[PDB]
Structure formats: structure tokens, C-alpha cells
Amino acid sequence: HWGYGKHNGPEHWHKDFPIAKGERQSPVDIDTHTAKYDPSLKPLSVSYDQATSLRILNNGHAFNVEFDDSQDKAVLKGGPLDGTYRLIQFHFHWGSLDGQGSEHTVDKKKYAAELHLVHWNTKYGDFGKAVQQPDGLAVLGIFLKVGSAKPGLQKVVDVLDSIKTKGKSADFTNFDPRGLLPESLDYWTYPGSLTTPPLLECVTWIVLKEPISVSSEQVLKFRKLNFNGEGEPEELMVDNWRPAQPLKNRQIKASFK
């Protein structure tokens, strides 16, 4: 099965998932001097006031916090998007050291971790149909840097011990994702893909310029998770990020000058 190890890592994915060498693969390096300001880009609209978190799960490659998406409770609109996108789950990518971990990079700079809030286009009825369309998904990317602790993140940090191994899940209600947003919503945007198999190219990426800060202690706890299932040799869940891919025929736009 695909993974992040030497024998099943990102460099091996193409064998099982040919799209890995596609034309709109993510992540990519964001070259700030090549990104173009776009005056026509609307401000991002994030309505997470009625969000309903349901559970937290270790899927063997990261941990997802899942939300109820049977209604427009938590939606993303505006920006380069056309229509309403419902939040379905968020997860992170992190490294074994503070100097690496994010998937996207800015002028080649790597961050300690990267948060991805996944949304699907409501006009397609459900997530499953959404990943069969070029504009089916919208992912909001937020960089994490090691510095001061992020209060709103501690709730996630404390429940990790209960989902240490692959397959474990735990009730995780009443979590407010608004506590994970930076102050500014300026962003870069480009058409891309999910960063893990099946690597589907249905994503409009929105990567925020402002990173949020997390404490060393908070990031350390992410690193105590396991890729393995209970009762198996322990493999720490670290460096679950994909290397930057070629931009090819794509332009990265900025919402700010």
C-alpha cells in the first residue's frame, strides 16, 4: 500500500496512480516573484459559525477531523470560487523536524506543518461526485510555524493519545475550526490536485500567506502518532508530506499586491 517510506513513498506512487505525473499535480513551490496579482479576485468568505465536528480518525497516513456536511453548516465561498463549498474534513501534514513538514513551499521555504481544510462543491450533490469534476473541490491551505502556542489547537492535541494507531477513531464534537485561522485572509490560488492517492485533479487551491504559530510541544504530540495499526511494529507518523511538483502550464494568482 502507498505510504511515505522508502519502498512505498511519493516517488513510487506513479506505479499505482499514473495521474501522479499529471499536468495539474500538487503541491508546488509558490514563487512570489512570479505569482500575479489579480484585481478581479474577490475576498474569501469563510462561514464556519455553524460548523458541526463529529469525529477524529487516524487513517494510517494522517488524522482527519470530520464534519457533518449534509447541509450548508460550514461553507467557503468568494475568492476564485464559483458557488458554495462545504467543509468535509481537515487534516495536517508535518515533518520529523521543525525545518520541514509543509507540502507547499514559498520561495523554496518549508514550514513545520501544513493544515488542509477540504471542501466540496455543493452543486455536485456529494463528495463522491465532486471528485469527478475539474472544479469539484476547494482546499484551504494554512502554514504552521513553530513559535507561540495556538490555543484553539490544543483541543485536537489532547485527543491524539486516543487515536494513536491506524483505524482508531474518537468522538470529537463541538470543535470550532475558526480557532485555526490566521488574522489575514490574503492568499495565492492555483488549480491543482489532492496530495495523496488517488491524487485527483479536482482542486482549486487557496493557500493563505499568513501562517499560524504553534508551540514546539504541540507539534511534538503530532509526531507521537503511529502509521501502523495496533499490535504491529511501531512506525512514528512523521514526514507525511509530498515533495513539490512541476508547475507546468499553470499560473499562480495572488489576492494581494
Ligand X SMILES: N[C@@H](Cc1c[nH]c[nH+]1)C(=O)O
CA pair distance 183, 81, nearest whole angstrom: 21
The answer to whether 12 is a known ligand-binding residue is no
By CB under 5 A, is residue 91 in contact with Hg ion? no
Is 93 labelled a binding residue?
yes
169 binds ligand X (CB under 6 A): no
Rounded distance between C-alpha atoms, residue 80 and residue 206, angstroms: 8
Question: Is residue 61 flagged as an active site residue?
Answer: yes
The reply to whether 116 sits near Zn ion by the rule CB under 5 A is yes
* By CB under 5 A, residue 202 contacts Hg ion: yes
Of 47, 59, 122, 169, the residue at the interface with ligand X (CB under 6 A) is 59
Is 33 annotated in a binding site? The answer is no
- Nearer to ligand X by Cβ, of 62 and 214: the residue is 62
Identify the burial level of 169 via C-beta atoms within 10 angstroms of its C-beta, where 0-12 means exposed, 13-18 middle and 19 or more buried. Answer: middle
Residue 196, marked binder: yes
The catalytic residue among 7, 14, 61, 119 is 61
Question: What phi and psi, each to the nearest 5 degrees, are found at residue 89?
Answer: -170, 160
Quick check: 154 and 219 in contact, CB under 8 A? no
Nearer to ligand X, 88 or 185 (CB): 88
**Cβ burial 87-124 (10 Å sphere, 16+ → b, else e):** bbbbbbbbbeebebbbbbbbeeebbbbbbbbbbbbbeb
Which residue stretch of 77-85, 109-117, 144-152, 232-240 sits at the interface with Zn ion (rule: CB under 5 A)?
109-117
Distance CA 22, CA 158 (A): 39
Q: Which of the ranges 20-28, 43-51, 97-105, 198-206 carries the binding residues for Hg ion, by CB under 5 A? A: 198-206
Is 163 a binding residue for Hg ion by CB under 5 A? The answer is: no
25, 15, 32: which is closest to 242 by C-alpha?
25
Nearer to ligand X, 1 or 33 (CB): 1
Task: Enumerate the active-site residues.
Answer: 61
Please report, in range form, the residues annotated as the binding site for substrate.
195-196
* Contact positions vs ligand X (CB under 6 A): 59, 64, 196, 198
